[PDB]
Amino acid sequence: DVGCSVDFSKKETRCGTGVFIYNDVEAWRDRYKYHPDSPRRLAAAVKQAWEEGICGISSVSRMENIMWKSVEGELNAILEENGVQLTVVVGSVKNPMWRGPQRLPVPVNELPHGWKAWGKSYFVRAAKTNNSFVVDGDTLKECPLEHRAWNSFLVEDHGFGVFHTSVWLKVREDYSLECDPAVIGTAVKGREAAHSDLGYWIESEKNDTWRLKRAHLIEMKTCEWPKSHTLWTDGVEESDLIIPKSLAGPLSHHNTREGYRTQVKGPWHSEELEIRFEECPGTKVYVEETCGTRGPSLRSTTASGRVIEEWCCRECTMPPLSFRAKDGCWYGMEIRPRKEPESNLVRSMVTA
Amino acid sequence: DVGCSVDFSKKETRCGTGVFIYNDVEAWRDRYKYHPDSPRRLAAAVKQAWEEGICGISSVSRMENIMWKSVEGELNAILEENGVQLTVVVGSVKNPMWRGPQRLPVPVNELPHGWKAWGKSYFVRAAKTNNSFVVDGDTLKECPLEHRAWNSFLVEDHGFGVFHTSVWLKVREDYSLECDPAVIGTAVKGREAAHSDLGYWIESEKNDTWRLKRAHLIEMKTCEWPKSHTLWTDGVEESDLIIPKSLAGPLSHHNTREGYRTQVKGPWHSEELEIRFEECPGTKVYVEETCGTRGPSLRSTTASGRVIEEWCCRECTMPPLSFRAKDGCWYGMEIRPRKEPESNLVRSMVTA
Amino acid sequence: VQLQESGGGLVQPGGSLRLSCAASGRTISRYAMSWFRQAPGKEREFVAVARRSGDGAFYADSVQGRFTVSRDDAKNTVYLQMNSLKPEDTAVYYCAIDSDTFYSGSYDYWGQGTQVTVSS
Amino acid sequence: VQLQESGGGLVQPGGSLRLSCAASGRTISRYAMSWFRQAPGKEREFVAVARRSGDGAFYADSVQGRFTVSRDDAKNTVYLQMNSLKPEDTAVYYCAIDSDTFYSGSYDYWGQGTQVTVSS
Amino acid sequence: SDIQMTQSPFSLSASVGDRVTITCRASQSISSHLNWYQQKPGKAPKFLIYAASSLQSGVPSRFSGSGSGTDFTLTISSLQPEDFATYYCQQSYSTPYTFGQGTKVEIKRTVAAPSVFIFPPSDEQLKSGTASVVCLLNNFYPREAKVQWKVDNALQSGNSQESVTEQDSKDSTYSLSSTLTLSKADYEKHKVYACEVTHQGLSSPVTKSFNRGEC
Amino acid sequence: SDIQMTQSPFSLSASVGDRVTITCRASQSISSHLNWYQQKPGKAPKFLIYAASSLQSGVPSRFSGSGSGTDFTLTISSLQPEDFATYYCQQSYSTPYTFGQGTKVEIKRTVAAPSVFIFPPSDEQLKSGTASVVCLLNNFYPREAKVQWKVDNALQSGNSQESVTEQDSKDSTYSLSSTLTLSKADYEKHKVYACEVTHQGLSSPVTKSFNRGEC
Amino acid sequence: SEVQLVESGGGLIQPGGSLRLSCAASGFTVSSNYMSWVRQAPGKGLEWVSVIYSGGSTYYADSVKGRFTISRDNSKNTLYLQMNSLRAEDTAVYYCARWGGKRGGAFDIWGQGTMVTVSSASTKGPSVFPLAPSSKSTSGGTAALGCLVKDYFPEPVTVSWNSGALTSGVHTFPAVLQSSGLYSLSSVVTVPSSSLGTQTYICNVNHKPSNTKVDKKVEPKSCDKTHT
Amino acid sequence: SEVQLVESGGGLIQPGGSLRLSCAASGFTVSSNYMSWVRQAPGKGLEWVSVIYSGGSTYYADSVKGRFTISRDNSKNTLYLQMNSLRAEDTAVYYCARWGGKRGGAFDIWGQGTMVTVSSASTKGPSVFPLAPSSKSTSGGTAALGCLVKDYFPEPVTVSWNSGALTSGVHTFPAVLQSSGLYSLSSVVTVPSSSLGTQTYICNVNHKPSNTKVDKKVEPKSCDKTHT
Ligand SMILES: *[C@@H]1O[C@H](CO)[C@@H](O)[C@H](O)[C@H]1NC(C)=O
Ligand SMILES: *[C@@H]1O[C@H](CO)[C@@H](O)[C@H](O)[C@H]1NC(C)=O
């Protein structure tokens, strides 16, 4: 991998050979084709799932939902052409993305139809039917979560990813709980390190010891980060990981900060979230031993938009931990209001 | 950090940010021109080391040895300005670079006046005395190993827009047993990863699960690799690390291969070494329960230059491990000849 | 803590009678109520036990089938339904309450009893 | 299996004497040998012990510092070098041999003894 | 923290043809990763239900599970003679994988009084320096029973061990044996030993006692 | 495996002004990371020498060390009264770090008066059901002494325990007490109880015995 | 293909010892499925211990955290558990179970199990004491008598009456572990009172490990004239 | 400032309990130096427990691997050792030490130590038995007599003769732990034979934990007429 780079703190410049990790989260990627195997086989799997009482699917990540949306119509066309009476409905996804107990099957053979959908870009209608294969959406009361699928896809290749941007997928044959490794990359160089995937970008630094620096998340998955793609795993207790192990947090010393316990009650209902160790505008934090115990995350602004100025914590290390979202600022559990009725506070929606 | 990438495996020309780690091992010889900061203080440190009973130095890495061999002159010149009577003699290195019990002092205050170093870096004139502060060489008898120093320097800053970037070293203040972290880099991307430093380049990939791929060695240190710069440290026993922990091997699953134990008696005396999992030319390795027990590693050719064509092992996975050196091709400890007696072959020297 | 039986009287053979034991000063939902009878010049023989809800009730072999016992936690009373009365059933029915929550038979209190006789 | 002591005789206080015992019928190199003494009408107390090579030797308070021991496996004979003899050392120095290989003090074979007296 | 699974009831009694309800509760939301296992004496568990509503291949249609979140239930439409066993509920959401305490399912059976017997320690055992007195309960139902030791009208505690046999195959009753172990010196210092038995089917406690020196 | 350390001798005795040398060892090449500590009874170890030849600040000049390869040595030129203690060598090369067994320094002033005694078990202890036979060795030296319990001419093994006191501060004596424990039933089965003391101070084993039932 | 899991490597061991358990597999490959170890102590429920993922990660229960180690041999198609620093508290039956292929997270296939006993006691024979009938063991014309077997190790012992002639009314209670480290059990039989003075009852106690065979005759005590 | 290491947190605990020791460093920061724990069992050598590097890496000895966990606090300048699943073998005196840098990796400065005892036995009082002198306890006109203190817990016990009047010839043997979990020691005194029939010898045994005080008079057995 011949390449080059330019420093920003300095002007050191060079090409050469090495290994290069790229940040694709804030860049927002670009248009992806997301070839979901052969739509013929996807149709066969969809039919086979219905025969065994499988209602819908729950998207692990935002890529899966977009792939479903982009292949919706042609799948319906294939179903209509062959002897099938079923409809697929796709809807907006919400966070956090919960785990489904079912897994889509792998058909032994393929539907007897004219296989013309390989590479078909939507733009086709089908006959509506009473029975529908709902994908996410708000189709919950129609069928509860216990009859949904989850994490059944496995990235196959990146054929012509530079310009055609084709991500090839497949249906896996293994039950698993870990996130897809084919899109994970982490590196350390001197006094800086980073863990990243298509939705997570986490940065760590050494200051008297390795610690968490900053994180930017556009999705909240529920798989678990594999160990092989993690730095310095041993010697840490899961009670201390800032990003919960249940929300796909790495098992690392780099994922820790001293004076803070694991954040399992944060505002994980948002769409875009940034973790920053800083005070938000108009707020201050003091350290006192008489402050309250841990509680749900509270927004810095009242429902009407008023701001609470004074907050206290017990045994936290400055700068304080906070979450940044388009709604406003959310503090961690360790920090509690110094003087404020709990009625005006917007409590984080506990995720279960 | 703007990017520069042309991946020939996939032919993707990207341009973004991230973190990049380069392979600098193959061009090590003259990558820097040091001038360790303030040699007027290094002179006082050497004088005090001589006074206290510290009579020599055993180099930790080839970089330090070249630093000595480049600053030998001006240092002697500074000695010949205040009446000090000592002569620094710098010799050649031998592998492995053993460890020294003592540490170089940190002078309380610099010499009364040593500005003669200003404007005279390399071309200087000095005198000679009887006292010797020997660096390296076949000179143990003049300063016994129990009085040599070792591992007394840290890199403060480095990196410049020049073929030879100036490095600002300093005298370490605290005792330590681990290698300097400021020049270590490692990363993993999909199915490939690498650990490296200025003299180590090690590669691993995924097949069933992660395993060692290859390594390139130009020096054999004796410091310990820090944990923070290691991937997946949990669950590995130190008896399976292919590169021994004492010889600066990392504690990782990436540093393991199935069917082989630690290599404590490999041909670690050669100048530079490369590790490959392939046959030595003109030879084959078998797997046989009846083969011999572990022992010292043997060279594939006799001292007379004749080749040995058949080798065996008991429980090793093919292809076999081997060492590529300037002398010739060697086989691992688990691998012994089938019929020819081992006393006829060349045995490697003892290291501990 | 007071036990008061009621609903006892002469009944012809084959008839139906239903007793009631008004309990006070205690929550019978957390305990078990048991029925015992003692004929004149005889011992005190087990009749039936009504455990808490979801545990069922156990009946003596002699009174098996004909009798039936039920509870009303709301009214804090135990109701026994009798079917196919016989002359041998003539006796004084003494109610009992099991103090032990594990149902060890640690009876502590008894009611005054009621006289009931069967004769055509 | 015979032990015969020799080299015993009168010595002035502060003198020097060297006892010697010639072992026969056994290999003392594989065993440990000890010295003993008995004053007339007295018990039989310590003199010194010579263990196998590389194990060192132990001495009694009265004899330590003054006495010295050395074995000779090749000639299967043990020697005691006495320094600064005292009148209190007057006794019959009695050799002994330890049968147990673990140095358990199991003495089974002994010699005749030799008279030693100290007087100026 | 680990996930705790509380089964209830500890045991229930039913006949052939009735409806049985078993509940399993979890201390935290676990989605629907719940399983049910059936274990017979001297055998490894067996796999019945997954996902809290799905039936494994080969499981008879009688069994059916329901519930979501924390509260889950198991039901049998028509109890059969071959359904006598213990039932465990397990959660597979995350490590560590915890099990339930288990519930024993038994046949209904009529109340029978316990016969009480007491045996003074044998003379041969007294020669060894230890004395053991045996109290026996035979052919009683239900299994719940209490046995108390009194020496010289003094209650004993921490000095007795009890063993309970399995439900009888013919009359479906139980037997209980409680053993009290005392040293020879301690045994001789007392005169009267008594075993008090409390049971549902006995109107008043039954006491069997003997005097040290009387045959 | 780990690298193992060793010391010799286990203990030695010398007077003031003697020269004493102690040898430590390592099972494999450790370069020269060898240390020495002194521990007086009831105190933490004190640090004397490092690097196998370097003297810590404040240590008396009479201490010195040397060695090469797998063998190392410590030496004291002129023994002083305040130099009675135990000595340990220690590594610092690689984990796990290891110590040596130790070596005790002894004074040179012992066997004032050997004495042998035996005590039959008291009747009070018999009433409890256990019998202890005590054999006493008073004011003897050296500590190497063998006590064998013989009952009815039968040798005893695995039923006795021994305790040794510290060096006497006045005459440098040592006291050893061996207790033989038998059950009361066992104690009545035998008639002659004897403890045999085999010690260098005794030329032949001295046997002290008592006869059960006889004063 | 038929699927099985078969354990091996159980036995008797002393405190502080070490042992290795082997769980073989057939019909499938252990590399592509999660594998776990589960155990059941005598008279108690089930207990999970450790798991190894198909990717290679491992997790352990606190009760064995550090003392045990799980590993698989991808070539020999075997699952291993290494046990060190054993205690008597680790006595139990041990199973290895397969993570379900498609049916959620469930132990689809179990094994037969192996017994592991951690005890320092040595083999010893039983002591039998007759439970002589008396007026305190009589109820409604029925007399209770038996034999008390005490202080034996290891299991099992077979107790029979009149060489198996008497079977009705026989109740052989389960063994119990005494604090001394030896087992004990009681056997009783109910017979008519009128048969005590005419019929003879003997209990046959056998202990194959110690090769102890005792025939003890249980008869009314001499001082009890009531049955004479 | 003076380099002092101060330890606290020891005590008595039952098997299976948990404890947390604190080693407070002074005069230097625990962050830059390597730190370790060392223990010494009663009457035994020295053993290394664990170490934590200045970089945060930690290592443990096998015998305590998993159960123990070493950690440090930089705000309070403290070194911690967390103990779980304690056994009886874990009783010893524990030390923390500094890893001297200018001294080639030497245990430069130590602490005063602290005692940890793991036992479930409850406080109990001693029983005093007299070691009556007899013809078997006399040698050359000197009579040996003593008192036996048995079955007591915990330490210590003080024994004196004649309220401290008699001190010469008295040897108090060290306490020894028995298999039952209790201690026993012996105290003996040598006196002239002729004084047995005229002098009175009484041993005072005191044990605070049991609040027991016993004064036992030792005299020749009545059947021993030689001393009358
Ligand atoms: C970072 O570094 C130094 C020591 O490395 C420390 O004193 C300083 O306070 C640290 N900074 C912060 C913001 O914690
Ligand atoms: C792993 O490596 C071997 C040797 O190169 C190769 O034959 C094999 O296909 C690879 N993959 C697997 C799954 O074994």
XYZ file of N, CA and C in Angstrom, chain C residues 6-115:
330
model
N -69.970 -20.574 62.499
C -71.403 -20.351 62.359
C -71.924 -21.231 61.231
N -73.249 -21.303 61.131
C -73.878 -22.062 60.067
C -74.009 -23.545 60.328
N -74.033 -23.959 61.588
C -74.169 -25.364 61.955
C -75.550 -25.643 62.522
N -76.133 -26.763 62.106
C -77.450 -27.142 62.586
C -77.822 -28.525 62.098
N -78.943 -29.017 62.621
C -79.430 -30.337 62.247
C -79.765 -30.379 60.761
N -79.375 -31.469 60.108
C -79.655 -31.672 58.690
C -80.015 -33.134 58.477
N -80.977 -33.375 57.592
C -81.375 -34.737 57.284
C -80.336 -35.398 56.376
N -80.220 -36.726 56.423
C -79.217 -37.400 55.589
C -79.421 -37.090 54.113
N -78.308 -36.919 53.405
C -78.344 -36.547 52.009
C -78.509 -35.067 51.751
N -78.603 -34.248 52.795
C -78.808 -32.826 52.642
C -77.513 -32.082 52.376
N -77.621 -30.755 52.391
C -76.495 -29.868 52.136
C -76.451 -28.788 53.207
N -75.259 -28.540 53.745
C -75.040 -27.479 54.715
C -73.740 -26.763 54.377
N -73.654 -25.497 54.783
C -72.486 -24.675 54.473
C -72.161 -23.816 55.686
N -70.963 -24.002 56.237
C -70.539 -23.302 57.439
C -69.800 -22.013 57.078
N -69.317 -21.319 58.107
C -68.583 -20.072 57.940
C -67.901 -19.733 59.257
N -66.658 -19.258 59.176
C -65.852 -18.952 60.355
C -65.306 -17.537 60.220
N -65.976 -16.578 60.854
C -65.602 -15.171 60.746
C -64.312 -14.934 61.521
N -63.243 -14.601 60.802
C -61.954 -14.313 61.411
C -61.763 -12.809 61.561
N -61.061 -12.421 62.624
C -60.798 -11.018 62.908
C -59.394 -10.870 63.475
N -58.808 -9.694 63.263
C -57.501 -9.388 63.806
C -56.343 -10.065 63.112
N -56.552 -10.622 61.922
C -55.494 -11.338 61.225
C -55.810 -11.371 59.737
N -54.754 -11.463 58.930
C -54.871 -11.587 57.482
C -54.697 -13.058 57.120
N -55.805 -13.725 56.786
C -55.758 -15.154 56.487
C -55.189 -15.454 55.110
N -54.947 -14.432 54.286
C -54.384 -14.675 52.962
C -52.953 -15.191 53.049
N -52.203 -14.758 54.059
C -50.823 -15.182 54.249
C -50.701 -16.472 55.050
N -51.816 -17.042 55.504
C -51.786 -18.263 56.301
C -52.742 -19.300 55.726
N -52.880 -20.435 56.407
C -53.754 -21.515 55.971
C -54.744 -21.847 57.076
N -55.985 -22.118 56.684
C -57.054 -22.474 57.608
C -57.371 -23.955 57.458
N -57.551 -24.637 58.586
C -57.788 -26.072 58.614
C -59.056 -26.374 59.401
N -59.718 -27.467 59.031
C -60.980 -27.873 59.634
C -60.791 -29.164 60.418
N -61.303 -29.182 61.646
C -61.246 -30.347 62.515
C -62.609 -30.567 63.154
N -62.939 -31.835 63.392
C -64.206 -32.212 63.998
C -63.955 -33.174 65.149
N -64.801 -33.080 66.172
C -64.696 -33.934 67.353
C -66.096 -34.382 67.747
N -66.394 -35.659 67.531
C -67.670 -36.205 67.956
C -67.673 -36.409 69.471
N -68.848 -36.430 70.097
C -68.895 -36.574 71.557
C -68.151 -37.821 72.014
N -67.301 -37.649 73.024
C -66.515 -38.755 73.534
C -65.511 -39.313 72.553
N -65.093 -38.523 71.566
C -64.153 -38.957 70.544
C -62.999 -37.965 70.468
N -62.039 -38.264 69.596
C -60.872 -37.412 69.430
C -61.164 -36.304 68.420
N -60.137 -35.509 68.129
C -60.216 -34.425 67.158
C -59.539 -34.894 65.874
N -60.342 -35.174 64.851
C -59.857 -35.748 63.605
C -59.768 -34.684 62.518
N -58.722 -34.786 61.702
C -58.539 -33.865 60.589
C -59.677 -34.007 59.586
N -60.106 -32.875 59.030
C -61.205 -32.850 58.072
C -60.668 -32.417 56.715
N -60.117 -31.208 56.650
C -59.584 -30.677 55.404
C -58.754 -29.443 55.717
N -57.837 -29.127 54.805
C -56.978 -27.953 54.910
C -57.060 -27.186 53.599
N -57.200 -25.867 53.694
C -57.258 -24.987 52.532
C -56.030 -24.086 52.554
N -55.063 -24.384 51.689
C -53.842 -23.601 51.610
C -54.100 -22.308 50.839
N -53.059 -21.489 50.707
C -53.193 -20.228 49.998
C -53.593 -20.478 48.543
N -53.934 -19.392 47.855
C -54.327 -19.491 46.457
C -53.196 -20.085 45.627
N -53.560 -20.964 44.696
C -52.597 -21.610 43.830
C -51.942 -22.848 44.402
N -52.257 -23.222 45.645
C -51.686 -24.408 46.266
C -52.648 -25.582 46.340
N -53.952 -25.342 46.219
C -54.926 -26.407 46.316
C -55.270 -26.738 47.755
N -56.172 -27.706 47.901
C -56.634 -28.156 49.205
C -56.574 -29.676 49.269
N -56.306 -30.189 50.465
C -56.211 -31.619 50.714
C -57.326 -32.049 51.656
N -57.958 -33.177 51.336
C -59.123 -33.663 52.058
C -58.824 -35.016 52.687
N -59.441 -35.265 53.838
C -59.300 -36.551 54.499
C -59.958 -37.649 53.667
N -59.469 -38.876 53.850
C -59.975 -39.992 53.058
C -61.460 -40.223 53.317
N -61.885 -40.127 54.578
C -63.288 -40.368 54.904
C -64.196 -39.325 54.264
N -63.800 -38.052 54.312
C -64.642 -36.964 53.825
C -64.310 -36.661 52.370
N -63.557 -37.550 51.727
C -63.167 -37.336 50.341
C -64.394 -37.274 49.440
N -64.384 -36.322 48.516
C -65.457 -36.188 47.532
C -66.691 -35.451 47.997
N -67.280 -35.878 49.115
C -68.519 -35.260 49.576
C -68.298 -33.816 50.012
N -67.181 -33.535 50.674
C -66.941 -32.210 51.225
C -66.184 -31.331 50.232
N -66.179 -30.031 50.520
C -65.452 -29.057 49.721
C -65.240 -27.810 50.565
N -64.036 -27.247 50.488
C -63.644 -26.096 51.290
C -63.139 -25.002 50.362
N -63.503 -23.759 50.668
C -63.087 -22.609 49.880
C -62.788 -21.448 50.816
N -62.053 -20.470 50.296
C -61.637 -19.303 51.058
C -62.070 -18.028 50.347
N -62.197 -16.956 51.131
C -62.523 -15.623 50.615
C -61.597 -14.636 51.324
N -60.454 -14.353 50.694
C -59.484 -13.447 51.300
C -60.073 -12.060 51.510
N -61.000 -11.645 50.644
C -61.613 -10.330 50.795
C -62.405 -10.233 52.093
N -63.181 -11.267 52.418
C -64.025 -11.262 53.605
C -63.375 -11.918 54.816
N -62.177 -12.479 54.671
C -61.453 -13.092 55.782
C -62.313 -14.148 56.477
N -62.769 -15.111 55.680
C -63.599 -16.195 56.179
C -63.336 -17.431 55.334
N -63.579 -18.597 55.926
C -63.417 -19.877 55.246
C -64.782 -20.543 55.151
N -65.140 -20.982 53.946
C -66.429 -21.600 53.666
C -66.226 -23.078 53.353
N -67.014 -23.936 53.999
C -67.006 -25.373 53.741
C -68.377 -25.784 53.223
N -68.400 -26.488 52.093
C -69.630 -26.992 51.494
C -69.703 -28.498 51.718
N -70.832 -28.966 52.245
C -71.056 -30.378 52.527
C -72.114 -30.931 51.582
N -71.852 -32.116 51.036
C -72.794 -32.829 50.187
C -72.978 -34.247 50.707
N -74.217 -34.733 50.665
C -74.540 -36.106 51.048
C -74.154 -36.375 52.505
N -74.784 -35.624 53.405
C -74.526 -35.797 54.828
C -74.961 -37.187 55.281
N -74.312 -37.679 56.327
C -74.582 -38.989 56.895
C -74.640 -38.893 58.411
N -75.317 -39.837 59.071
C -75.415 -39.771 60.539
C -74.069 -39.755 61.240
N -73.065 -40.451 60.702
C -71.759 -40.487 61.351
C -71.123 -39.107 61.447
N -71.542 -38.161 60.605
C -70.930 -36.839 60.586
C -71.282 -36.004 61.811
N -72.220 -36.456 62.641
C -72.626 -35.708 63.827
C -71.436 -35.448 64.742
N -71.068 -34.177 64.908
C -69.929 -33.814 65.742
C -69.785 -32.300 65.839
N -68.850 -31.836 66.663
C -68.550 -30.416 66.804
C -67.348 -30.105 65.923
N -67.509 -29.138 65.022
C -66.465 -28.773 64.070
C -65.648 -27.623 64.651
N -64.398 -27.907 65.014
C -63.485 -26.903 65.547
C -62.546 -26.451 64.436
N -62.580 -25.161 64.120
C -61.689 -24.615 63.111
C -60.297 -24.394 63.698
N -59.304 -24.359 62.813
C -57.924 -24.163 63.227
C -57.200 -23.352 62.163
N -56.118 -22.700 62.582
C -55.313 -21.857 61.708
C -53.852 -22.242 61.883
N -53.144 -22.396 60.766
C -51.746 -22.812 60.774
C -50.865 -21.568 60.792
N -50.171 -21.348 61.911
C -49.327 -20.164 62.036
C -48.125 -20.225 61.102
N -47.556 -21.410 60.900
C -46.349 -21.535 60.093
C -46.651 -21.233 58.629
N -45.843 -20.353 58.032
C -46.009 -20.038 56.617
C -45.547 -21.190 55.735
N -44.583 -21.978 56.210
C -44.133 -23.171 55.506
C -45.125 -24.326 55.624
N -46.205 -24.154 56.389
C -47.242 -25.177 56.535
C -46.699 -26.408 57.264
N -46.105 -26.174 58.432
C -45.579 -27.238 59.276
C -46.618 -27.811 60.230
N -47.856 -27.327 60.185
C -48.871 -27.803 61.104
C -48.759 -27.235 62.499
N -48.174 -26.046 62.644
C -48.000 -25.417 63.954
C -49.269 -24.641 64.292
N -50.314 -25.390 64.632
C -51.590 -24.795 65.002
C -51.479 -24.111 66.357
N -52.102 -22.937 66.471
C -51.945 -22.104 67.658
C -53.285 -21.700 68.263
N -54.288 -21.455 67.423
C -55.584 -20.969 67.877
C -56.698 -21.857 67.341
N -57.799 -21.899 68.088
C -58.982 -22.657 67.706
C -60.225 -21.848 68.047
N -61.315 -22.138 67.326
C -62.589 -21.512 67.606
C -63.393 -22.280 68.641
N -64.547 -21.713 69.002
C -65.396 -22.349 70.003
C -66.108 -23.579 69.457
N -66.258 -23.685 68.140
C -66.919 -24.816 67.529
C -68.423 -24.630 67.427
N -69.038 -25.489 66.616
C -70.477 -25.468 66.405
C -70.994 -26.898 66.384
N -72.162 -27.108 66.987
C -72.764 -28.431 67.077
C -73.593 -28.693 65.826
